[PDB]
Amino acid sequence: GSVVELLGKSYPQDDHSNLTRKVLTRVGRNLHNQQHHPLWLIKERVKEHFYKQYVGRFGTPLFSVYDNLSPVVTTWQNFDSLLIPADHPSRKKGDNYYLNRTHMLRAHTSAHQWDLLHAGLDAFLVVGDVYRRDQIDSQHYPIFHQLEAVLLFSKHELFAGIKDGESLQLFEQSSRSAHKQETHTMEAVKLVEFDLKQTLTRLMAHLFGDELEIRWVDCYFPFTHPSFEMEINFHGEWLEVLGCGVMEQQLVNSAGAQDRIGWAFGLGLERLAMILYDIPDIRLFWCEDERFLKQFCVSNINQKVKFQPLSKYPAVINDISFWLPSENYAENDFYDLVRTIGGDLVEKVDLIDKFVHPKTHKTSHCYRITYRHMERTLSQREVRHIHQALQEAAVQLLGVEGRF
Ligand SMILES: N[C@@H](Cc1ccccc1)C(=O)O
């Protein structure tokens, strides 16, 4: 219709609006605040590291923790506050859940960094549900959870370890390099980067034990420089679990935190939980199967959980092919439709073939859908009927022409 009502507020619909009822109905579910949920367990262990295991020169900073911020944010909060350019590909309608042109469900917990800095906070964690439009497989879900951490330092704290530290400065006017921002001194950046990497290495040792294999990968974000991803070697592959870096000075200065340099990080809770607990499919976080959920009810949050694998059920594979409409088709629109109709019956969707017809000039797409339930065997009848409903919905709602 013309308006969406969410959390007591009204959003007029426009050309950017792309929310689905299934996604909207999970706003407020807050799995990260559900006692004994694995995502809540990871949040509680990370909070304990900051409460008891982080120490600086001036003692432990008191990190305040915000786990109940509304996910409805403006484009300015999600993008402009973090220096994301207007033409950046992360803003595309295909990849984000937009209530309208002005409001969206946050795609990251970094959407709250400016506001919390603007409130005068120098040490904080944000934990919350985040929303992205993407592909369907065992590692991707429309809703996932992140833990954000921000720590700011004055020159007095950063240089407290040396007698003439008061003569050193956070800022200078030089040039941006791979190692630093144009207005940062190398003296400050090396100390901030070291504290960021040391804190994260220690936290991973406090979540996983002492035999973990991690590596730092240099990368880019518009809101940090220098920036890194931490990867964990798991099942023979290097997997990214977080993004981090030295906060861009324009962001810190814009929020009113003058004379501070900071580090920031964003952890993917499902990515970490899937490695820490050997959870094979991200749909298990949303299931109500006691075989999965009972395993995370522990008396001490430091108990090493040894998750017991669930039985794996057979799959039913079906292909769906259709001619795309002349304009405006996006693969994410089809993936959203599969999530709406197929739901948690669908393990993955792969685009396996595309071609252009010589006479009509139309593009054909062929998608392979793997139906596999996490809790039971699927009947051939339920998959056949659901697959047919998906074909009808694609023609009616996406304007495709069936090749069926
Ligand atoms: N917001 C980034 C992670 C990040 C957070 C903080 C600093 C740098 C990177 C993401 O979602 O990938």
Side-chain angles (χ1 to χ4, degrees):
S2 71
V3 172
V4 156
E5 293 170 69
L6 183 58
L7 300 173
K9 304 183 180 191
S10 296
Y11 301 90
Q13 303 296 278
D14 68 15
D15 62 355
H16 270 67
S17 301
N18 64 6
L19 259 303
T20 73
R21 178 193 197 221
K22 275 206 191 173
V23 172
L24 283 166
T25 215
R26 283 157 179 81
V27 172
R29 176 65 181 90
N30 299 349
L31 297 180
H32 64 292
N33 297 338
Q34 171 172 313
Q35 185 179 35
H36 314 299
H37 193 278
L39 302 178
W40 168 93
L41 187 51
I42 293 189
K43 176 188 79 182
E44 291 295 313
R45 299 191 69 194
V46 174
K47 285 166 58 179
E48 190 174 281
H49 163 82
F50 285 100
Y51 171 60
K52 305 178 166 194
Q53 291 285 303
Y54 180 98
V55 187
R57 299 194 137 90
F58 291 170
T60 298
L62 196 177
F63 278 84
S64 45
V65 181
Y66 305 88
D67 67 12
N68 191 31
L69 302 188
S70 170
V72 183
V73 296
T74 63
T75 61
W76 190 86
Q77 286 169 298
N78 199 85
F79 298 116
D80 300 282
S81 74
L82 298 174
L83 320 173
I84 295 162
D87 68 358
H88 200 271
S90 76
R91 297 178 176 262
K92 71 183 96 165
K93 296 176 182 191
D95 295 352
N96 298 275
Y97 289 109
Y98 282 103
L99 284 164
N100 53 37
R101 282 186 117 108
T102 301
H103 288 99
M104 66 186 288
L105 295 183
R106 61 179 175 227
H108 54 176
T109 46
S110 309
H112 303 293
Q113 282 188 18
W114 191 95
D115 287 321
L116 276 64
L117 288 171
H118 191 59
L121 301 173
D122 277 38
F124 54 91
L125 311 182
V126 178
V127 194
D129 44 319
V130 302
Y131 297 82
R132 291 188 194 172
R133 299 189 68 213
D134 213 337
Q135 68 196 54
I136 306 176
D137 64 45
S138 70
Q139 314 292 301
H140 289 86
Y141 207 67
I143 312 180
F144 66 96
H145 299 78
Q146 295 187 317
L147 186 149
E148 201 83 3
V150 167
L151 185 57
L152 303 186
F153 300 87
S154 77
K155 72 197 298 299
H156 314 293
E157 180 177 341
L158 208 65
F159 303 131
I162 55 158
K163 77 85 184 176
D164 62 336
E166 290 294 309
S167 73
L168 298 184
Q169 296 179 93
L170 299 185
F171 312 116
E172 71 183 25
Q173 296 299 301
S174 59
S175 80
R176 182 178 172 108
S177 69
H179 311 99
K180 70 175 206 70
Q181 292 166 38
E182 76 275 10
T183 77
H184 282 170
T185 63
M186 196 63 78
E187 290 74 34
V189 176
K190 292 306 188 180
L191 293 183
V192 174
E193 177 181 330
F194 185 82
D195 196 67
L196 167 63
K197 290 181 169 170
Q198 175 181 74
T199 301
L200 283 172
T201 296
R202 280 199 271 99
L203 171 67
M204 296 302 161
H206 170 69
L207 293 173
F208 288 81
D210 76 327
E211 201 75 54
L212 191 61
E213 290 286 350
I214 71 172
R215 73 182 181 178
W216 295 100
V217 173
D218 292 331
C219 64
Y220 171 84
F221 302 100
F223 41 97
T224 51
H225 183 66
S227 307
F228 318 86
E229 279 153 357
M230 192 203 279
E231 293 182 342
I232 296 180
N233 196 267
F234 176 72
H235 291 184
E237 299 180 330
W238 287 106
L239 301 181
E240 68 193 321
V241 296
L242 67 86
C244 66
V246 176
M247 300 175 69
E248 279 286 358
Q249 201 58 43
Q250 183 182 340
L251 157 63
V252 174
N253 287 353
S254 73
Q258 275 83 33
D259 295 306
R260 293 291 184 277
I261 184 165
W263 60 240
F265 70 74
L267 304 182
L269 298 188
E270 282 88 351
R271 289 192 315 188
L272 205 66
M274 289 176 72
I275 296 170
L276 182 64
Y277 307 122
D278 197 18
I279 295 162
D281 190 297
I282 197 166
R283 291 176 294 166
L284 287 167
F285 299 112
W286 301 90
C287 83
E288 316 291 326
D289 192 343
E290 277 304 307
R291 293 171 300 190
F292 178 75
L293 291 174
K294 77 185 168 192
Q295 309 200 46
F296 304 96
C297 308
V298 299
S299 33
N300 188 285
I301 60 171
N302 293 317
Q303 216 184 321
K304 165 154 204 178
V305 359
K306 302 213 126 144
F307 171 82
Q308 303 286 313
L310 306 161
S311 301
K312 183 159 187 186
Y313 303 94
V316 179
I317 315 306
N318 287 321
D319 291 350
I320 173 173
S321 302
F322 43 74
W323 301 107
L324 266 39
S326 299
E327 312 291 324
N328 309 323
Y329 178 88
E331 291 172 41
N332 282 343
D333 299 343
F334 180 63
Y335 305 146
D336 263 329
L337 183 62
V338 172
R339 295 286 196 187
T340 293
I341 302 283
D344 285 355
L345 308 180
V346 176
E347 179 182 47
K348 33 196 274 288
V349 180
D350 285 315
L351 178 48
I352 63 170
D353 187 50
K354 62 171 76 177
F355 70 92
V356 172
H357 195 274
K359 292 194 200 178
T360 70
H361 329 304
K362 295 170 173 173
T363 297
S364 161
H365 279 192
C366 181
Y367 297 91
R368 178 153 289 161
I369 307 186
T370 299
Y371 294 87
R372 187 196 305 275
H373 204 296
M374 294 306 302
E375 311 169 43
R376 60 180 178 84
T377 296
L378 282 179
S379 62
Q380 292 291 323
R381 92 183 174 276
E382 75 188 308
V383 175
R384 172 173 81 83
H385 289 295
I386 290 293
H387 189 78
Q388 180 66 47
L390 174 62
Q391 287 178 335
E392 290 162 357
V395 165
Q396 181 168 265
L397 302 173
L398 304 183
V400 308
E401 181 168 333
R403 297 186 65 228
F404 314 158

PDB file of all heavy atoms in Angstrom, residues 220-238:
ATOM      1  N   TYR A 220      39.770  -1.842   2.606  1.00  0.00           N
ATOM      2  CA  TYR A 220      39.273  -0.448   2.533  1.00  0.00           C
ATOM      3  C   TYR A 220      37.833  -0.305   3.029  1.00  0.00           C
ATOM      4  O   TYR A 220      37.012  -1.112   2.708  1.00  0.00           O
ATOM      5  CB  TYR A 220      39.329   0.069   1.087  1.00  0.00           C
ATOM      6  CG  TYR A 220      38.652   1.399   0.877  1.00  0.00           C
ATOM      7  CD1 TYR A 220      39.304   2.580   1.136  1.00  0.00           C
ATOM      8  CD2 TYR A 220      37.330   1.462   0.500  1.00  0.00           C
ATOM      9  CE1 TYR A 220      38.670   3.796   0.984  1.00  0.00           C
ATOM     10  CE2 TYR A 220      36.675   2.668   0.380  1.00  0.00           C
ATOM     11  CZ  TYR A 220      37.355   3.833   0.610  1.00  0.00           C
ATOM     12  OH  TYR A 220      36.734   5.015   0.464  1.00  0.00           O
ATOM     13  N   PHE A 221      37.607   0.728   3.842  1.00  0.00           N
ATOM     14  CA  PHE A 221      36.249   1.221   4.161  1.00  0.00           C
ATOM     15  C   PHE A 221      36.304   2.745   4.029  1.00  0.00           C
ATOM     16  O   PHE A 221      37.280   3.297   4.317  1.00  0.00           O
ATOM     17  CB  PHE A 221      35.806   0.853   5.577  1.00  0.00           C
ATOM     18  CG  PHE A 221      35.796  -0.623   5.855  1.00  0.00           C
ATOM     19  CD1 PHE A 221      36.832  -1.212   6.532  1.00  0.00           C
ATOM     20  CD2 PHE A 221      34.773  -1.416   5.413  1.00  0.00           C
ATOM     21  CE1 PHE A 221      36.848  -2.570   6.752  1.00  0.00           C
ATOM     22  CE2 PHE A 221      34.784  -2.775   5.654  1.00  0.00           C
ATOM     23  CZ  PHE A 221      35.832  -3.343   6.302  1.00  0.00           C
ATOM     24  N   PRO A 222      35.229   3.453   3.656  1.00  0.00           N
ATOM     25  CA  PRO A 222      35.270   4.906   3.638  1.00  0.00           C
ATOM     26  C   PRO A 222      35.384   5.572   5.019  1.00  0.00           C
ATOM     27  O   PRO A 222      35.737   6.656   5.066  1.00  0.00           O
ATOM     28  CB  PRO A 222      33.919   5.270   3.005  1.00  0.00           C
ATOM     29  CG  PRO A 222      33.621   4.091   2.133  1.00  0.00           C
ATOM     30  CD  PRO A 222      34.040   2.928   3.003  1.00  0.00           C
ATOM     31  N   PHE A 223      35.051   4.843   6.089  1.00  0.00           N
ATOM     32  CA  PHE A 223      34.985   5.395   7.460  1.00  0.00           C
ATOM     33  C   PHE A 223      36.188   5.021   8.337  1.00  0.00           C
ATOM     34  O   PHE A 223      36.222   5.447   9.441  1.00  0.00           O
ATOM     35  CB  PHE A 223      33.634   5.037   8.082  1.00  0.00           C
ATOM     36  CG  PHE A 223      33.141   3.641   7.820  1.00  0.00           C
ATOM     37  CD1 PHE A 223      33.331   2.639   8.738  1.00  0.00           C
ATOM     38  CD2 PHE A 223      32.466   3.340   6.658  1.00  0.00           C
ATOM     39  CE1 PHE A 223      32.867   1.359   8.497  1.00  0.00           C
ATOM     40  CE2 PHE A 223      32.015   2.061   6.412  1.00  0.00           C
ATOM     41  CZ  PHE A 223      32.228   1.069   7.321  1.00  0.00           C
ATOM     42  N   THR A 224      37.117   4.233   7.816  1.00  0.00           N
ATOM     43  CA  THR A 224      38.372   3.934   8.537  1.00  0.00           C
ATOM     44  C   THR A 224      39.558   3.959   7.574  1.00  0.00           C
ATOM     45  O   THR A 224      39.336   3.771   6.446  1.00  0.00           O
ATOM     46  CB  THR A 224      38.386   2.581   9.256  1.00  0.00           C
ATOM     47  OG1 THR A 224      37.983   1.572   8.359  1.00  0.00           O
ATOM     48  CG2 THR A 224      37.488   2.532  10.467  1.00  0.00           C
ATOM     49  N   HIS A 225      40.727   4.300   8.082  1.00  0.00           N
ATOM     50  CA  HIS A 225      41.999   4.233   7.330  1.00  0.00           C
ATOM     51  C   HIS A 225      43.163   4.359   8.313  1.00  0.00           C
ATOM     52  O   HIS A 225      43.183   5.319   9.010  1.00  0.00           O
ATOM     53  CB  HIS A 225      42.090   5.294   6.250  1.00  0.00           C
ATOM     54  CG  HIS A 225      43.337   5.119   5.499  1.00  0.00           C
ATOM     55  ND1 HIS A 225      43.587   4.045   4.717  1.00  0.00           N
ATOM     56  CD2 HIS A 225      44.411   5.898   5.472  1.00  0.00           C
ATOM     57  CE1 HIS A 225      44.781   4.167   4.249  1.00  0.00           C
ATOM     58  NE2 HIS A 225      45.260   5.276   4.684  1.00  0.00           N
ATOM     59  N   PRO A 226      44.125   3.422   8.394  1.00  0.00           N
ATOM     60  CA  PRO A 226      44.100   2.131   7.697  1.00  0.00           C
ATOM     61  C   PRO A 226      43.021   1.160   8.190  1.00  0.00           C
ATOM     62  O   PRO A 226      42.507   1.362   9.194  1.00  0.00           O
ATOM     63  CB  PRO A 226      45.482   1.531   7.983  1.00  0.00           C
ATOM     64  CG  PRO A 226      45.860   2.132   9.292  1.00  0.00           C
ATOM     65  CD  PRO A 226      45.312   3.539   9.223  1.00  0.00           C
ATOM     66  N   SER A 227      42.680   0.218   7.330  1.00  0.00           N
ATOM     67  CA  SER A 227      41.588  -0.737   7.575  1.00  0.00           C
ATOM     68  C   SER A 227      42.038  -2.175   7.353  1.00  0.00           C
ATOM     69  O   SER A 227      42.936  -2.416   6.595  1.00  0.00           O
ATOM     70  CB  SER A 227      40.421  -0.461   6.694  1.00  0.00           C
ATOM     71  OG  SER A 227      39.999   0.868   6.791  1.00  0.00           O
ATOM     72  N   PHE A 228      41.437  -3.073   8.130  1.00  0.00           N
ATOM     73  CA  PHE A 228      41.801  -4.503   8.101  1.00  0.00           C
ATOM     74  C   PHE A 228      40.575  -5.385   8.266  1.00  0.00           C
ATOM     75  O   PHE A 228      39.588  -4.980   8.751  1.00  0.00           O
ATOM     76  CB  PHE A 228      42.726  -4.884   9.268  1.00  0.00           C
ATOM     77  CG  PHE A 228      43.810  -3.886   9.570  1.00  0.00           C
ATOM     78  CD1 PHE A 228      43.551  -2.825  10.407  1.00  0.00           C
ATOM     79  CD2 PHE A 228      44.985  -3.877   8.860  1.00  0.00           C
ATOM     80  CE1 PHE A 228      44.489  -1.832  10.608  1.00  0.00           C
ATOM     81  CE2 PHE A 228      45.919  -2.883   9.060  1.00  0.00           C
ATOM     82  CZ  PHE A 228      45.672  -1.869   9.929  1.00  0.00           C
ATOM     83  N   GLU A 229      40.690  -6.573   7.704  1.00  0.00           N
ATOM     84  CA  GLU A 229      39.727  -7.632   8.014  1.00  0.00           C
ATOM     85  C   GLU A 229      40.505  -8.683   8.791  1.00  0.00           C
ATOM     86  O   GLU A 229      41.633  -8.905   8.480  1.00  0.00           O
ATOM     87  CB  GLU A 229      39.139  -8.266   6.763  1.00  0.00           C
ATOM     88  CG  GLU A 229      38.034  -7.440   6.189  1.00  0.00           C
ATOM     89  CD  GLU A 229      37.876  -7.626   4.698  1.00  0.00           C
ATOM     90  OE1 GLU A 229      38.672  -8.352   4.115  1.00  0.00           O
ATOM     91  OE2 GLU A 229      36.975  -6.993   4.130  1.00  0.00           O
ATOM     92  N   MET A 230      39.896  -9.262   9.799  1.00  0.00           N
ATOM     93  CA  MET A 230      40.551 -10.395  10.464  1.00  0.00           C
ATOM     94  C   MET A 230      39.947 -11.654   9.850  1.00  0.00           C
ATOM     95  O   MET A 230      38.765 -11.723   9.753  1.00  0.00           O
ATOM     96  CB  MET A 230      40.310 -10.414  11.968  1.00  0.00           C
ATOM     97  CG  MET A 230      41.211 -11.396  12.660  1.00  0.00           C
ATOM     98  SD  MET A 230      40.619 -11.985  14.269  1.00  0.00           S
ATOM     99  CE  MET A 230      41.108 -10.634  15.295  1.00  0.00           C
ATOM    100  N   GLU A 231      40.797 -12.586   9.461  1.00  0.00           N
ATOM    101  CA  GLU A 231      40.355 -13.885   8.917  1.00  0.00           C
ATOM    102  C   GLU A 231      40.778 -14.981   9.890  1.00  0.00           C
ATOM    103  O   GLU A 231      41.804 -14.879  10.466  1.00  0.00           O
ATOM    104  CB  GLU A 231      40.922 -14.122   7.523  1.00  0.00           C
ATOM    105  CG  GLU A 231      40.380 -13.181   6.471  1.00  0.00           C
ATOM    106  CD  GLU A 231      40.904 -13.429   5.073  1.00  0.00           C
ATOM    107  OE1 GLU A 231      41.889 -14.079   4.959  1.00  0.00           O
ATOM    108  OE2 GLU A 231      40.313 -12.943   4.153  1.00  0.00           O
ATOM    109  N   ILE A 232      39.930 -15.984  10.011  1.00  0.00           N
ATOM    110  CA  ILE A 232      40.193 -17.184  10.833  1.00  0.00           C
ATOM    111  C   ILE A 232      40.290 -18.369   9.867  1.00  0.00           C
ATOM    112  O   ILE A 232      39.476 -18.469   9.007  1.00  0.00           O
ATOM    113  CB  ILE A 232      39.067 -17.391  11.854  1.00  0.00           C
ATOM    114  CG1 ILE A 232      39.007 -16.229  12.846  1.00  0.00           C
ATOM    115  CG2 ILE A 232      39.264 -18.711  12.575  1.00  0.00           C
ATOM    116  CD1 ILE A 232      37.919 -16.371  13.876  1.00  0.00           C
ATOM    117  N   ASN A 233      41.299 -19.211  10.036  1.00  0.00           N
ATOM    118  CA  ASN A 233      41.406 -20.408   9.173  1.00  0.00           C
ATOM    119  C   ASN A 233      40.500 -21.479   9.770  1.00  0.00           C
ATOM    120  O   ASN A 233      40.695 -21.825  10.879  1.00  0.00           O
ATOM    121  CB  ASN A 233      42.855 -20.869   9.019  1.00  0.00           C
ATOM    122  CG  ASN A 233      43.018 -21.823   7.862  1.00  0.00           C
ATOM    123  OD1 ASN A 233      42.955 -23.012   8.044  1.00  0.00           O
ATOM    124  ND2 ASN A 233      43.184 -21.312   6.678  1.00  0.00           N
ATOM    125  N   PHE A 234      39.488 -21.867   9.020  1.00  0.00           N
ATOM    126  CA  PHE A 234      38.486 -22.828   9.511  1.00  0.00           C
ATOM    127  C   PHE A 234      38.109 -23.764   8.379  1.00  0.00           C
ATOM    128  O   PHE A 234      37.810 -23.351   7.326  1.00  0.00           O
ATOM    129  CB  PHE A 234      37.242 -22.067   9.960  1.00  0.00           C
ATOM    130  CG  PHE A 234      36.098 -22.933  10.408  1.00  0.00           C
ATOM    131  CD1 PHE A 234      36.155 -23.609  11.600  1.00  0.00           C
ATOM    132  CD2 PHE A 234      34.968 -23.048   9.633  1.00  0.00           C
ATOM    133  CE1 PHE A 234      35.093 -24.386  12.014  1.00  0.00           C
ATOM    134  CE2 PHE A 234      33.913 -23.831  10.054  1.00  0.00           C
ATOM    135  CZ  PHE A 234      33.980 -24.485  11.246  1.00  0.00           C
ATOM    136  N   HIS A 235      38.229 -25.054   8.661  1.00  0.00           N
ATOM    137  CA  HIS A 235      37.925 -26.117   7.674  1.00  0.00           C
ATOM    138  C   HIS A 235      38.757 -25.912   6.402  1.00  0.00           C
ATOM    139  O   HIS A 235      38.237 -26.097   5.338  1.00  0.00           O
ATOM    140  CB  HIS A 235      36.410 -26.256   7.470  1.00  0.00           C
ATOM    141  CG  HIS A 235      35.674 -26.805   8.644  1.00  0.00           C
ATOM    142  ND1 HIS A 235      34.337 -27.065   8.614  1.00  0.00           N
ATOM    143  CD2 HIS A 235      36.074 -27.145   9.872  1.00  0.00           C
ATOM    144  CE1 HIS A 235      33.975 -27.572   9.753  1.00  0.00           C
ATOM    145  NE2 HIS A 235      34.991 -27.635  10.527  1.00  0.00           N
ATOM    146  N   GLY A 236      40.020 -25.536   6.566  1.00  0.00           N
ATOM    147  CA  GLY A 236      40.952 -25.372   5.448  1.00  0.00           C
ATOM    148  C   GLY A 236      40.817 -24.089   4.654  1.00  0.00           C
ATOM    149  O   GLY A 236      41.457 -24.009   3.645  1.00  0.00           O
ATOM    150  N   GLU A 237      39.990 -23.151   5.107  1.00  0.00           N
ATOM    151  CA  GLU A 237      39.781 -21.893   4.345  1.00  0.00           C
ATOM    152  C   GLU A 237      39.932 -20.686   5.263  1.00  0.00           C
ATOM    153  O   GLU A 237      39.564 -20.773   6.367  1.00  0.00           O
ATOM    154  CB  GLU A 237      38.347 -21.781   3.838  1.00  0.00           C
ATOM    155  CG  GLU A 237      37.946 -22.870   2.900  1.00  0.00           C
ATOM    156  CD  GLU A 237      36.524 -22.772   2.385  1.00  0.00           C
ATOM    157  OE1 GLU A 237      35.654 -22.257   3.082  1.00  0.00           O
ATOM    158  OE2 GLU A 237      36.321 -23.223   1.279  1.00  0.00           O
ATOM    159  N   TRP A 238      40.428 -19.592   4.707  1.00  0.00           N
ATOM    160  CA  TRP A 238      40.512 -18.330   5.479  1.00  0.00           C
ATOM    161  C   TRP A 238      39.165 -17.619   5.337  1.00  0.00           C
ATOM    162  O   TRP A 238      38.790 -17.331   4.237  1.00  0.00           O
ATOM    163  CB  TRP A 238      41.642 -17.478   4.930  1.00  0.00           C
ATOM    164  CG  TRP A 238      43.006 -17.973   5.267  1.00  0.00           C
ATOM    165  CD1 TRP A 238      43.891 -18.596   4.444  1.00  0.00           C
ATOM    166  CD2 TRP A 238      43.648 -17.858   6.539  1.00  0.00           C
ATOM    167  NE1 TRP A 238      45.038 -18.865   5.121  1.00  0.00           N
ATOM    168  CE2 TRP A 238      44.927 -18.432   6.402  1.00  0.00           C
ATOM    169  CE3 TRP A 238      43.274 -17.328   7.768  1.00  0.00           C
ATOM    170  CZ2 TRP A 238      45.827 -18.481   7.451  1.00  0.00           C
ATOM    171  CZ3 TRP A 238      44.166 -17.374   8.799  1.00  0.00           C
ATOM    172  CH2 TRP A 238      45.422 -17.947   8.639  1.00  0.00           C
TER     173      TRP A 238
END
